Amino acid sequence: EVKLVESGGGLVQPGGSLKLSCAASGFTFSRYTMSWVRQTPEKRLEWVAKIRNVGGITYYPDTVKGRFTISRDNAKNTLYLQMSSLKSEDTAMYYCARHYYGSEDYFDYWGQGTTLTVSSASTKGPSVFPLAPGTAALGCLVKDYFPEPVTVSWNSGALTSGVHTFPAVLQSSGLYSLSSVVTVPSSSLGTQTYICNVNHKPSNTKVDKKV
Amino acid sequence: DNVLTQSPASLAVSLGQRATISCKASQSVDYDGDSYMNWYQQKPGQPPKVFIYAASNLESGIPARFSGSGSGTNFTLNIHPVEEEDAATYYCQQSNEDPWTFGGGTKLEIKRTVAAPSVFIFPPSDEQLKSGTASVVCLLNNFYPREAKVQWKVDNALQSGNSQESVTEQDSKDSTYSLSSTLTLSKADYEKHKVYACEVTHQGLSSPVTKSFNR
Ligand SMILES: *[C@@H]1O[C@H](CO)[C@@H](O)[C@H](O)[C@H]1NC(C)=O
């Protein structure tokens, strides 16, 4: 099974630098042409960089040429994107993508992405509050964090049925907030324990909140 | 750059009917008898996934209801008959010339029968009130269509300017949406009042539904 795993994203000041990594497994990495593709907050997809399986030949769009460097370490099965003189418009989810062998004319595998935020705003961890409860509803309010993203699970990933984690909303303050909710049998309220697990990696925040 | 323009930007199609999405390129993507336009599907929280490559070829593992056509500057993705799991955003992408470019995406909504929301209201927690802020939450669960009116009332007075809404992406199984509306008050303001009510108007509701609590 082919797998690509991006890492290294984070919050960077405008004008700063950051290097992303993509760990490749399940195929002969050296035989493949590889690209980075990013997706802006507006959901626009932008090809960012390409490195061929031959000659270390690299290609870039004019928007990043001179600031971004793609490279590869075939012995360690790793792809890299070094970014410098970063701009607000570079804020995006960054994906590692493999080109179909031979004709190389489409992306046949992608990683799950790593998030880059270019901003002068400070990191802020979330506050997690309970939404306390036929069917009953309950949940967790994840409020006032920056930057995106946050992850929310229930009972460590055992409880997924009936779970809705809402897209974050940007408040006028510049901080994000979201809720995660779950519906359960109102009879199970007495016996069953419900814990929301919140992760905000940019602030090193891991919280479990019992509802 | 070869700028790609998709139309429409969003599309709603009944179950079992045909979805047609177009992509126009600013210059031709033909080379030596093939046309280098790809189509990708993207679902929330996932990377895009290729469905069609070089205008008309299905990727291995793709259902037969998907097909691609066109050449030069004009391409079409067809889905027929659409299924619930086809709710997604679809992107075209040209590979004829560097830089590779993507269209802006078309979101496909799958139409279903009207489904009324189940409505829930949540008071602010004691913990948060300590911070001097009160967030009151109203949940509208598993409804269709997306259009809904959520009004906050406080001691029966209509609120404006102090709430925000968030809506889930369409469910891949049953084609519904859920929605949250959060009302944000100061502690002082919150404690000035007794009755907090969320009133919901929706096509599936025989009349507006109010959920409320007393502080
Ligand atoms: C592009 O294709 C669609 C149908 O495939 C059609 O409606 C439209 O007229 C075409 N545009 C041109 C310029 O041929």
Coordinates of C-alpha atoms and ligand atoms in Angstrom, one line a residue:
Chain A
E1 CA 0.0 0.0 0.0
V2 CA 1.3 3.4 -1.2
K3 CA 1.4 6.0 1.5
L4 CA 2.6 9.6 1.5
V5 CA 2.8 11.4 4.9
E6 CA 3.4 15.2 5.0
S7 CA 4.9 16.9 8.1
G8 CA 6.5 20.2 9.2
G9 CA 3.7 22.7 8.7
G10 CA 3.1 25.4 11.3
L11 CA 2.7 29.1 12.0
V12 CA 5.4 31.4 10.5
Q13 CA 5.9 35.2 10.5
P14 CA 5.6 36.9 7.1
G15 CA 9.1 36.9 5.6
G16 CA 10.0 33.7 7.4
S17 CA 11.1 30.3 6.3
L18 CA 9.9 26.7 6.8
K19 CA 10.7 23.3 5.4
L20 CA 8.1 20.6 4.8
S21 CA 8.7 16.9 4.6
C22 CA 6.9 14.0 2.9
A23 CA 7.7 10.5 3.9
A24 CA 7.0 8.0 1.1
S25 CA 6.4 4.2 1.6
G26 CA 5.0 1.3 -0.4
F27 CA 6.7 2.0 -3.7
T28 CA 10.1 2.6 -5.3
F29 CA 10.3 6.3 -4.6
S30 CA 13.3 7.0 -6.9
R31 CA 11.3 6.0 -10.0
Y32 CA 8.6 8.6 -9.6
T33 CA 8.2 12.3 -10.4
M34 CA 6.8 14.1 -7.4
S35 CA 5.0 17.4 -6.8
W36 CA 3.8 19.6 -4.0
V37 CA 0.2 21.0 -4.5
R38 CA -1.4 23.4 -2.1
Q39 CA -5.1 24.3 -1.3
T40 CA -5.9 27.8 -0.1
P41 CA -8.4 28.6 2.6
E42 CA -10.8 29.5 -0.3
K43 CA -10.4 25.8 -1.5
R44 CA -8.3 26.8 -4.6
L45 CA -5.8 24.2 -5.6
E46 CA -2.4 25.4 -6.8
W47 CA 0.5 23.3 -8.1
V48 CA 3.6 24.6 -6.3
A49 CA 6.6 22.5 -7.3
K50 CA 7.8 19.4 -9.2
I51 CA 10.9 17.3 -9.2
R52 CA 11.5 14.7 -11.9
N53 CA 12.8 11.2 -11.4
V54 CA 15.7 12.2 -13.6
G55 CA 18.5 14.8 -13.3
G56 CA 17.0 16.5 -10.3
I57 CA 15.1 18.7 -12.7
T58 CA 12.8 21.0 -10.9
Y59 CA 9.8 23.1 -12.0
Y60 CA 7.9 25.9 -10.2
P61 CA 5.2 28.4 -11.0
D62 CA 6.3 32.0 -11.2
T63 CA 4.4 32.7 -7.9
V64 CA 7.0 30.8 -5.8
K65 CA 10.0 30.5 -8.1
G66 CA 13.1 31.9 -6.3
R67 CA 11.5 31.4 -2.9
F68 CA 10.6 27.7 -2.8
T69 CA 13.0 24.7 -3.4
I70 CA 11.8 21.2 -3.9
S71 CA 14.3 18.4 -3.2
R72 CA 14.4 14.6 -2.7
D73 CA 16.4 12.1 -0.7
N74 CA 15.9 8.8 -2.6
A75 CA 17.8 6.8 0.0
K76 CA 15.5 8.0 2.8
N77 CA 12.3 8.0 0.6
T78 CA 11.6 11.6 1.5
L79 CA 10.4 14.6 -0.5
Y80 CA 11.1 18.2 0.8
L81 CA 9.8 21.7 0.2
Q82 CA 12.0 24.5 1.6
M83 CA 10.1 27.8 1.7
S84 CA 11.5 31.2 2.3
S85 CA 10.3 34.9 2.2
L86 CA 6.9 33.6 3.0
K87 CA 3.8 35.6 2.3
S88 CA 0.2 35.6 3.6
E89 CA -0.9 34.2 0.2
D90 CA 1.3 31.1 0.9
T91 CA -1.1 30.1 3.7
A92 CA -2.6 26.8 2.6
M93 CA -2.8 23.0 3.2
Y94 CA 0.3 21.5 1.5
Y95 CA 0.1 18.1 -0.1
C96 CA 2.7 15.7 -1.5
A97 CA 1.5 14.1 -4.8
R98 CA 2.8 11.3 -6.9
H99 CA 2.8 11.5 -10.7
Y100 CA 1.4 8.4 -12.6
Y101 CA 4.4 6.3 -13.8
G102 CA 5.5 6.9 -17.4
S103 CA 3.3 9.5 -18.8
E104 CA 3.3 11.5 -15.5
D105 CA 0.2 13.3 -16.6
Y106 CA -2.0 13.1 -13.5
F107 CA -1.6 12.7 -9.7
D108 CA -2.4 9.1 -8.7
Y109 CA -1.7 9.4 -5.0
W110 CA -1.8 12.2 -2.4
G111 CA -0.9 12.6 1.3
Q112 CA -3.3 13.9 3.9
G113 CA -1.7 17.3 4.0
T114 CA 0.2 19.6 6.4
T115 CA -1.0 23.1 7.2
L116 CA 1.0 26.3 6.7
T117 CA -0.2 29.6 8.2
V118 CA 1.7 32.8 7.5
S119 CA 0.7 35.5 9.9
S120 CA 1.9 37.9 12.5
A121 CA -0.8 36.7 14.9
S122 CA 0.2 34.7 18.0
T123 CA -0.6 31.1 18.7
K124 CA -3.6 30.6 21.0
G125 CA -4.8 27.4 22.4
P126 CA -8.5 26.7 22.7
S127 CA -10.8 26.7 25.7
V128 CA -13.1 23.6 25.8
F129 CA -16.5 23.9 27.3
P130 CA -19.3 21.3 27.7
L131 CA -22.6 21.5 25.9
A132 CA -24.7 19.5 28.4
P133 CA -27.8 17.5 27.3
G134 CA -36.1 9.7 22.3
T135 CA -32.6 11.1 21.6
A136 CA -30.4 13.5 23.5
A137 CA -27.7 15.8 22.1
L138 CA -24.5 16.9 23.8
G139 CA -21.2 18.2 22.8
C140 CA -18.2 20.4 23.2
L141 CA -17.5 24.0 22.3
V142 CA -13.8 24.6 21.2
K143 CA -13.4 28.4 21.5
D144 CA -10.8 31.1 20.7
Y145 CA -7.9 29.3 19.1
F146 CA -5.4 30.2 16.4
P147 CA -4.3 29.0 14.0
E148 CA -6.3 26.2 12.3
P149 CA -6.7 23.4 12.6
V150 CA -8.2 21.5 15.7
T151 CA -9.1 17.8 15.8
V152 CA -12.0 16.5 17.9
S153 CA -12.8 12.9 18.7
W154 CA -15.3 11.3 21.2
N155 CA -14.3 8.6 23.7
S156 CA -10.9 8.3 21.9
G157 CA -12.4 7.4 18.5
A158 CA -14.8 4.7 19.8
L159 CA -17.9 6.9 19.4
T160 CA -18.3 8.1 15.8
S161 CA -22.0 7.4 15.1
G162 CA -24.0 10.6 15.3
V163 CA -21.0 12.9 15.5
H164 CA -21.0 16.3 13.8
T165 CA -17.9 18.4 14.1
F166 CA -18.7 21.8 12.6
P167 CA -16.4 23.8 10.3
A168 CA -14.6 26.4 12.3
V169 CA -15.9 30.0 12.1
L170 CA -13.6 33.0 12.2
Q171 CA -14.7 35.5 14.9
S172 CA -14.1 39.2 14.5
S173 CA -11.2 38.9 17.0
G174 CA -9.3 36.8 14.5
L175 CA -9.7 33.7 16.6
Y176 CA -11.5 30.5 15.5
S177 CA -14.3 28.6 17.3
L178 CA -16.3 25.5 16.6
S179 CA -18.6 23.0 18.2
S180 CA -18.6 19.2 18.1
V181 CA -21.9 17.5 18.9
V182 CA -23.2 13.9 19.2
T183 CA -26.7 12.4 19.5
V184 CA -27.3 9.4 21.7
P185 CA -30.2 7.5 23.2
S186 CA -31.4 9.6 26.1
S187 CA -31.5 6.4 28.2
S188 CA -27.7 5.9 27.8
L189 CA -27.1 9.3 29.5
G190 CA -27.2 7.7 33.0
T191 CA -24.8 4.8 32.3
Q192 CA -22.5 5.9 29.5
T193 CA -19.5 8.3 29.8
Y194 CA -18.9 10.9 27.0
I195 CA -15.5 12.5 26.6
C196 CA -14.6 15.0 23.8
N197 CA -10.8 14.8 23.0
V198 CA -9.5 18.1 21.5
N199 CA -6.1 18.4 19.8
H200 CA -4.6 21.8 18.8
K201 CA -1.1 20.9 17.6
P202 CA 0.1 24.5 16.9
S203 CA -0.2 25.2 20.7
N204 CA 0.7 21.7 21.9
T205 CA -2.9 21.5 23.4
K206 CA -4.4 18.1 24.3
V207 CA -7.6 18.3 26.3
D208 CA -10.2 15.7 27.4
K209 CA -13.5 17.2 28.5
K210 CA -16.2 15.1 30.2
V211 CA -19.8 16.1 29.3
Chain B
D1 CA -0.9 30.3 -17.5
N2 CA -3.7 28.1 -19.0
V3 CA -6.5 29.4 -16.8
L4 CA -9.3 26.9 -16.3
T5 CA -12.9 28.1 -15.7
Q6 CA -15.6 25.7 -14.4
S7 CA -19.3 26.0 -14.7
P8 CA -21.6 26.1 -12.9
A9 CA -19.8 26.8 -9.6
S10 CA -22.4 24.7 -7.8
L11 CA -25.1 22.3 -9.0
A12 CA -28.0 20.4 -7.4
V13 CA -29.1 17.2 -8.9
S14 CA -31.9 14.8 -7.9
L15 CA -31.0 11.2 -7.0
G16 CA -30.9 9.1 -10.1
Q17 CA -30.6 12.1 -12.5
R18 CA -27.7 13.4 -14.5
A19 CA -25.0 15.9 -13.3
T20 CA -23.0 17.7 -16.0
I21 CA -20.0 19.9 -15.1
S22 CA -18.1 21.9 -17.6
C23 CA -14.4 23.1 -17.7
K24 CA -13.1 25.5 -20.3
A25 CA -9.4 26.1 -20.9
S26 CA -7.9 29.4 -22.1
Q27 CA -5.7 27.5 -24.5
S28 CA -5.9 24.0 -26.0
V29 CA -4.6 21.0 -24.0
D30 CA -4.4 18.7 -27.1
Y31 CA -1.1 17.1 -27.8
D32 CA -0.6 14.4 -30.5
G33 CA -4.1 13.0 -30.5
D34 CA -4.8 13.1 -26.8
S35 CA -6.3 15.8 -24.6
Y36 CA -4.6 16.4 -21.2
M37 CA -7.4 17.3 -18.9
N38 CA -8.0 15.4 -15.7
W39 CA -10.9 15.4 -13.3
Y40 CA -10.6 14.9 -9.5
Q41 CA -13.2 14.4 -6.8
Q42 CA -12.7 15.9 -3.3
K43 CA -14.6 15.2 -0.1
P44 CA -14.2 17.2 3.1
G45 CA -11.1 16.4 5.0
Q46 CA -9.5 14.4 2.2
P47 CA -7.1 15.2 -0.6
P48 CA -8.5 15.2 -4.2
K49 CA -8.8 11.8 -5.9
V50 CA -8.4 11.3 -9.7
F51 CA -11.5 10.0 -11.4
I52 CA -10.9 10.8 -15.1
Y53 CA -7.5 11.3 -16.8
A54 CA -6.7 12.6 -20.3
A55 CA -10.2 13.8 -20.9
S56 CA -12.1 10.5 -21.2
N57 CA -10.2 7.7 -19.4
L58 CA -11.6 6.3 -16.1
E59 CA -9.1 5.6 -13.4
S60 CA -9.1 2.0 -12.2
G61 CA -11.6 1.6 -9.4
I62 CA -14.1 4.3 -10.5
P63 CA -17.8 3.5 -10.9
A64 CA -19.3 3.4 -14.4
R65 CA -21.7 6.3 -13.8
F66 CA -18.7 8.7 -14.2
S67 CA -17.5 9.7 -17.7
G68 CA -15.5 12.5 -19.3
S69 CA -15.6 14.0 -22.8
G70 CA -14.2 16.9 -24.8
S71 CA -11.1 18.1 -26.5
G72 CA -9.2 21.3 -27.2
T73 CA -10.5 23.9 -24.7
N74 CA -13.9 22.3 -23.8
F75 CA -14.4 19.5 -21.4
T76 CA -17.3 17.9 -19.6
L77 CA -17.7 15.6 -16.6
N78 CA -20.9 13.5 -16.6
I79 CA -22.3 11.6 -13.7
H80 CA -25.4 9.5 -14.3
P81 CA -27.3 8.3 -12.4
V82 CA -26.1 10.3 -9.4
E83 CA -25.9 8.6 -6.0
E84 CA -25.8 10.1 -2.5
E85 CA -22.0 9.4 -2.2
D86 CA -21.4 11.7 -5.2
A87 CA -21.9 14.8 -3.1
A88 CA -18.5 16.4 -3.4
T89 CA -16.5 19.1 -5.1
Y90 CA -15.1 18.3 -8.6
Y91 CA -12.0 19.9 -10.1
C92 CA -10.6 19.9 -13.6
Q93 CA -6.8 20.1 -14.0
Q94 CA -4.7 20.4 -17.2
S95 CA -1.4 18.7 -17.6
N96 CA -0.4 19.8 -21.1
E97 CA 1.8 22.6 -20.1
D98 CA 3.7 23.9 -17.1
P99 CA 2.5 25.3 -14.7
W100 CA -0.2 22.6 -14.3
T101 CA -3.4 24.5 -13.4
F102 CA -6.7 23.6 -11.7
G103 CA -10.2 24.9 -12.2
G104 CA -12.0 26.5 -9.3
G105 CA -14.1 23.5 -8.5
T106 CA -17.8 22.7 -8.8
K107 CA -19.8 21.6 -5.7
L108 CA -22.4 18.9 -6.4
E109 CA -25.4 18.8 -4.0
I110 CA -27.6 15.7 -4.2
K111 CA -31.3 16.5 -3.9
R112 CA -33.4 14.4 -1.6
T113 CA -36.9 14.6 0.0
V114 CA -37.5 17.3 2.6
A115 CA -36.3 16.3 6.1
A116 CA -37.1 18.4 9.1
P117 CA -34.3 19.3 11.6
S118 CA -34.2 18.0 15.1
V119 CA -33.6 21.1 17.3
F120 CA -31.5 21.3 20.5
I121 CA -30.5 24.3 22.7
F122 CA -27.5 24.4 25.1
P123 CA -27.0 27.0 27.9
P124 CA -23.5 28.3 28.6
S125 CA -21.4 26.3 30.9
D126 CA -20.5 27.5 34.4
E127 CA -16.8 27.3 33.4
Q128 CA -17.2 29.8 30.5
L129 CA -19.3 32.2 32.5
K130 CA -16.3 32.6 34.9
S131 CA -14.5 34.1 31.9
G132 CA -17.1 36.8 31.6
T133 CA -18.6 35.5 28.3
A134 CA -21.7 33.3 27.6
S135 CA -22.1 31.3 24.5
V136 CA -25.6 29.8 23.9
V137 CA -25.7 27.1 21.2
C138 CA -28.6 26.0 19.0
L139 CA -28.2 22.7 17.0
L140 CA -30.3 21.8 13.9
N141 CA -29.6 18.2 13.2
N142 CA -29.9 16.2 9.9
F143 CA -32.2 18.3 7.7
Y144 CA -32.7 19.0 4.0
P145 CA -32.7 21.5 2.2
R146 CA -29.9 23.6 3.6
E147 CA -32.0 26.8 3.8
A148 CA -33.1 27.4 7.4
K149 CA -34.0 30.5 9.5
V150 CA -32.7 30.5 13.0
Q151 CA -33.8 33.4 15.3
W152 CA -32.6 34.0 18.8
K153 CA -35.0 35.5 21.4
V154 CA -34.0 36.7 24.9
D155 CA -37.0 37.4 27.2
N156 CA -38.9 37.2 23.9
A157 CA -36.8 40.0 22.3
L158 CA -35.3 39.4 18.8
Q159 CA -31.5 39.3 18.7
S160 CA -29.4 40.6 15.8
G161 CA -25.7 41.0 15.3
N162 CA -24.6 38.7 18.0
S163 CA -24.7 35.2 16.5
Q164 CA -22.8 33.1 14.0
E165 CA -23.8 29.9 12.1
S166 CA -21.8 27.0 10.8
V167 CA -23.1 24.2 8.5
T168 CA -21.7 20.7 7.9
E169 CA -21.0 19.4 4.5
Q170 CA -23.7 17.3 2.9
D171 CA -23.8 13.7 4.4
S172 CA -22.5 11.1 2.0
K173 CA -25.1 8.5 3.2
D174 CA -28.4 10.4 3.6
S175 CA -27.8 13.8 1.9
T176 CA -28.7 15.9 5.0
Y177 CA -27.0 18.9 6.7
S178 CA -26.6 19.9 10.3
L179 CA -26.2 23.5 11.5
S180 CA -25.0 25.3 14.7
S181 CA -26.0 28.8 15.7
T182 CA -24.0 30.4 18.5
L183 CA -25.2 33.4 20.4
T184 CA -22.5 35.3 22.3
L185 CA -23.2 37.6 25.2
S186 CA -21.3 39.2 28.0
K187 CA -21.9 37.6 31.4
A188 CA -23.5 40.7 32.7
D189 CA -25.9 40.8 29.8
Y190 CA -26.6 37.1 30.1
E191 CA -27.5 37.4 33.8
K192 CA -29.9 40.3 33.0
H193 CA -32.3 37.9 31.4
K194 CA -34.3 34.7 32.0
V195 CA -35.6 33.1 28.9
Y196 CA -33.3 32.0 26.1
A197 CA -35.0 30.7 22.9
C198 CA -34.0 29.4 19.5
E199 CA -36.8 29.5 16.9
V200 CA -36.3 27.6 13.7
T201 CA -38.2 28.0 10.4
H202 CA -37.7 25.3 7.8
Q203 CA -39.6 23.7 4.9
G204 CA -39.9 20.4 6.7
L205 CA -41.5 21.9 9.8
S206 CA -45.2 22.2 9.9
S207 CA -44.7 25.5 11.9
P208 CA -41.7 27.2 13.5
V209 CA -40.1 25.1 16.3
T210 CA -38.9 26.9 19.5
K211 CA -36.5 25.4 22.0
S212 CA -35.8 27.3 25.1
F213 CA -34.5 27.3 28.6
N214 CA -34.6 29.5 31.7
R215 CA -31.3 30.6 33.1
Ligands
LIG1 C1 -18.7 22.9 -24.6 O1 -19.4 21.7 -24.3 C2 -20.8 21.7 -23.9 C3 -21.3 20.3 -24.0 O2 -20.3 19.3 -23.9 C4 -21.6 22.7 -24.8 O3 -22.8 23.1 -24.1 C5 -20.9 24.0 -25.2 O4 -21.6 24.6 -26.3 C6 -19.4 23.7 -25.6 N1 -18.8 24.9 -26.0 C7 -18.3 25.1 -27.2 C8 -17.6 26.5 -27.4 O5 -18.4 24.3 -28.1

